[PDB]
Design a protein around this nucleic acid. Sequence first.
RNA 1: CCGGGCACUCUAACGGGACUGCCCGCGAAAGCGGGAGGAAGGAGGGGACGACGUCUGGUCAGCAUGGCCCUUACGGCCUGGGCGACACACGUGCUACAAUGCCCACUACAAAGCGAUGCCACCCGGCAACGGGGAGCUAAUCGCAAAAAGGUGGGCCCAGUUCGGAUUGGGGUCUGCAACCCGACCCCAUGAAGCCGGAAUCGCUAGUAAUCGCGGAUCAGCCAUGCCGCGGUGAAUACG
Lengths: 60, 118, 127, 24, 84, 206, 98, 155, 92
Amino acid sequence: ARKALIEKAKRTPKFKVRAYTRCVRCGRARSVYRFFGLCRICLRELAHKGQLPGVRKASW
Amino acid sequence: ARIAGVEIPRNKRVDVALTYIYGIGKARAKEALEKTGINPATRVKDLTEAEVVRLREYVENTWKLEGELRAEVAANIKRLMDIGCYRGLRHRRGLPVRGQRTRTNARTRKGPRKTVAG
Amino acid sequence: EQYYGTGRRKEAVARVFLRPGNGKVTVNGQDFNEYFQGLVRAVAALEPLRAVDALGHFDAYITVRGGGKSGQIDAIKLGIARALVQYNPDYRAKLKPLGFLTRDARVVERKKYGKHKARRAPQYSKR
Amino acid sequence: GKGDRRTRRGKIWRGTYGKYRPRK
Amino acid sequence: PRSLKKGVFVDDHLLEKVLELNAKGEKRLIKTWSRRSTIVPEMVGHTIAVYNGKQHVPVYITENMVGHKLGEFAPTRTYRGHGK
Amino acid sequence: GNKIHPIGFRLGITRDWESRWYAGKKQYRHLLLEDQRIRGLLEKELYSAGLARVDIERAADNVAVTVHVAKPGVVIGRGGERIRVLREELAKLTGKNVALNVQEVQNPNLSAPLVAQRVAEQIERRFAVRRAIKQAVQRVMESGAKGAKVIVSGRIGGAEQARTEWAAQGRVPLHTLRANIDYGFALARTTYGVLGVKAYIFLGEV
Amino acid sequence: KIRIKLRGFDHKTLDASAQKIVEAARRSGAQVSGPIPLPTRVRRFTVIRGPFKHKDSREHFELRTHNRLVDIINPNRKTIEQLMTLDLPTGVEIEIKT
Amino acid sequence: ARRRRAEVRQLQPDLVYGDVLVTAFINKIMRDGKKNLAARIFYDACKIIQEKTGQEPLKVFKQAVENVKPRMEVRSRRVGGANYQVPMEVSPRRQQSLALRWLVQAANQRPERRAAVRIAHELMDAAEGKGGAVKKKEDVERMAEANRAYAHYRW
Amino acid sequence: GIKSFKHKGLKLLFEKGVTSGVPAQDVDRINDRLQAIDTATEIGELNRQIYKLHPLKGDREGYWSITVRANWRITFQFINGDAYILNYEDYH
RNA sequence: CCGGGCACUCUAACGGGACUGCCCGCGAAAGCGGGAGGAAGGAGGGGACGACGUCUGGUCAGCAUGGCCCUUACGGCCUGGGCGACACACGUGCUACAAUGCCCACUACAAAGCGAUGCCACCCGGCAACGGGGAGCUAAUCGCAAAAAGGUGGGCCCAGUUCGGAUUGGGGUCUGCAACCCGACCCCAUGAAGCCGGAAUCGCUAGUAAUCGCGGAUCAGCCAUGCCGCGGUGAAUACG
Ligand SMILES: [Mg+2]
Ligand SMILES: [Mg+2]
Ligand SMILES: [Mg+2]
Ligand SMILES: [Mg+2]
Ligand SMILES: [Mg+2]
Ligand SMILES: [Mg+2]
Ligand SMILES: [Mg+2]
Ligand SMILES: [Mg+2]
Ligand SMILES: [Mg+2]
Ligand SMILES: [Mg+2]
Ligand SMILES: [Mg+2]
Ligand SMILES: [Mg+2]
Ligand SMILES: [Mg+2]
Ligand SMILES: [Mg+2]
Ligand SMILES: [Mg+2]
Ligand SMILES: [Mg+2]
Ligand SMILES: [Mg+2]
Ligand SMILES: [Mg+2]
Ligand SMILES: [Mg+2]
Ligand SMILES: [Mg+2]
Ligand SMILES: [Zn+2]
């Protein structure tokens, strides 16, 4: 997660297979969920704050 | 009845029996019987000399079987082995060819484990 | 004229409709013995009938959807047990002591994380 | 069994279709 | 049991650079990083040097090895043998 | 390393979300990244105002945003000149065209985020940690609240060994799912390093 | 025959919302088909609790979406009057197709 | 079981003989919860006991269980160093569990290719007093009463 | 003579002079130690007071441990005038 | 399926119900045993939830941050290779050694999920993967989808086999600029070890174990036999 390696936003894939999610908050390329643009961590951090609209804690 | 290169499948269903040939599998079995129109269930012994001829002829002449086949396959390998072909080197080195892991699980291609000190 | 009783088991719902008649059963169309074609358990469902000497006195139309033919066999068994009460509410006295009027609450257990199957815990070696 | 890629189960297990587990 | 489909792929770095040499006959060497390319007849006779990912190894392309893909003739790893 | 966020834990009850707006599939991720852009600047700016929460409602190209502050003045500006700068700096971020209300905090002494930041700051100024903490719990405890508690991370006083300071009064049931405990965290950059600050305030119950 | 479909995250921000729509138009059109529920679609996000390893941490998060219908047959101007511009909830979003 | 004295699960009687003991035996035949195939096998068997034997299957069965129930068994125990095998009675409860288990085991130890038969023939042999089932049973008692010296460690 | 490395940072400092694998202030320290372990013809030479030499116990038997600085150790196996498996390691 | 009808199943929102409340027994009390009613009990079954602290626990490689170090480079772009190497050792698993089974056919019950260039009905070409064409769906109203185990009928006849599918030869599809290194899938041929596992060792007390299939996230594709979750059938045993 180096500024340098956030060339992902560059579109210019030369070929669209070189495209890759990346966290829209920490750059955590590793675990990024689509529906949020966030990685498994941030998703969890924000869900705890309430900044994820209608994203309550599951249980059953 | 004896069919292809030294083939003698007997006392079992003809399909099953044809399987006992080098180049014949459960697939070519139902076909060779399909075309040559013979019950597959007939016990090889209970077959007819007429059926054994249509089979003997249809099969022997329709597919490359037995020795002549092993000859081909062997011939192939020899080729990609003569040319610097990586795939060919995997044959020489005796390691798996179809890109599998050779750190563990390759015994079917390596043989028995050859334990060393560690 | 007609009698009703639902009946649910391990996630199965059975609409049970008793009707004074011969004693046959139409489960989802097919005959009782036709839907449960070869299931040593089937016989169970109608047990609440033999309970009070019914069957050859009633008749049953049954809709069954949900689960498996085994769970359905128990839902239906409960249905025939309930409906048999709207008819004569006096059946409880003998129908209940058998427990036919209970709703087996045994359901699949949630699959918890960290474990392979809700309980089946993964194994270790030279721990 | 579940492992023979050219049988009903072998196809079902591998979640696929072919000459051994046609669509219908 | 390999397979590409319809359109035998060959990078045109060496392609249009190999046939250009077909005009004056052949040449004396080449060198491409395109080990990704399939080999076509026009390559025969030639001598393309492929990249290990470290070196440029000289590979004489003969008929018997057409359909293959260059890289299949330029080993990556080394091994050499385990111990001992 | 245990215990959940007291808020996220209670979201179903005794605590509403900071962004309450429907959306989905193709939008949600875009319509959310925005919210963060929003909050981003507000916290970067309205610091001295005393930030505490940034509600963000929506319906369509007419966003809400209801910054909550201790000093509503600092926000607004002179006659309302700043609420002009920001409110505009806002659309230079979201063409969306959005409002910008401002509610005042009734006693910043019951705002976990505030009490936290309050302490976070003192610590940055080099005040005695334990004191600052005890004081804070007092203020909070001394102006309502049925319970409060503050926690400072480590490297207290710049000490080479990271420690952890306490302080608490009255019921502060993290387990009771219905307490209504305000949680607030404050950082604290320093010559020697970061030191997190946690504020917990308990109010009523049911 | 104006088919309304209401979706929201809060099962109250709808029962409130979609219920207004019922009492309102119940004085300018048919009599409404009552706010019919409709199955909810839940989205689960199973995440490892901490960063770096600990495969078996987890903790579940779900984003359940609720739906409502209603349905007003016999549309009569005043209906599109009591409704047209008198809503309230913010955590809701409608779609209508008469 | 540190606390309670774990009570025995009571089983629903047979769907043909209404005999609980039968369900039990059927459960011991079952594997992977395929209780149908399990029930079948035992019934097919009961009909094999009807043909080759003019007796009612149900009575042949119970007779079997009877001869296969061990009345004495040896239980290991550490007593001053060595682990002496102490001989002792067998609960009525445990007798059954063992009897049924042993039957199914010996039954699946027979040769006849058909599952339903192995059970059929095993049961009969058991009734007569012969068969792999009764072997184990008599082997157990032999084991005890052969270690009836350490029986003063009664347990 | 040093013959094998287990620590990559250690490996790079002695071979290429690459210092980016070790602490910056322990560069000179680690260097003089490695050269000593390289020149050592027997374990007895690696015995200067400032090294606090000792063989490890338990599963680490056959290994040795001179002290760099603080709670930091360079561990290795010395045998026939050579050290093997040079590791820059924390005692915990 | 049509009109019609909300009864029923159901869908989702709310309300009721369990509290040793009632009956008998012991007890000082708490409560223990028993019984009635009840869908259900004496915490009815499963989750969320983890105290003061411990291990100098784990991660500066998610992010944040003190200090140290590098700045034609310890930064940055690119093509190619590597992370996929192997004489070996271990952990977690998948498949299996078969007849309570395998194969073909016919026929029946589920839940929870996901779908815009996305799910893909149906029709056609292909043994097939898949290709061409094209309806509906914006998804309780269309699609993924066939549930599998199971029931019925046939084949196999105890053999390394109609068990088991490794490995290898050939042909081919599909994604992607590109599948040598190093993708998955299909069809033909090949058809290995394996006949139930030494010392030692792991899980689980009921709808659990065991067994069967179904969905999802990530995601072009996929090395998923992993992970998170769903329902089907459904035990043994616990003296102590
Ligand atoms: Mg960075
Ligand atoms: Mg990608
Ligand atoms: Mg299950
Ligand atoms: Mg644990
Ligand atoms: Mg097979
Ligand atoms: Mg050019
Ligand atoms: Mg695991
Ligand atoms: Mg835990
Ligand atoms: Mg010493
Ligand atoms: Mg009392
Ligand atoms: Mg609690
Ligand atoms: Mg440590
Ligand atoms: Mg790896
Ligand atoms: Mg290991
Ligand atoms: Mg297995
Ligand atoms: Mg066709
Ligand atoms: Mg059959
Ligand atoms: Mg076994
Ligand atoms: Mg995928
Ligand atoms: Mg799956
Ligand atoms: Zn992130």
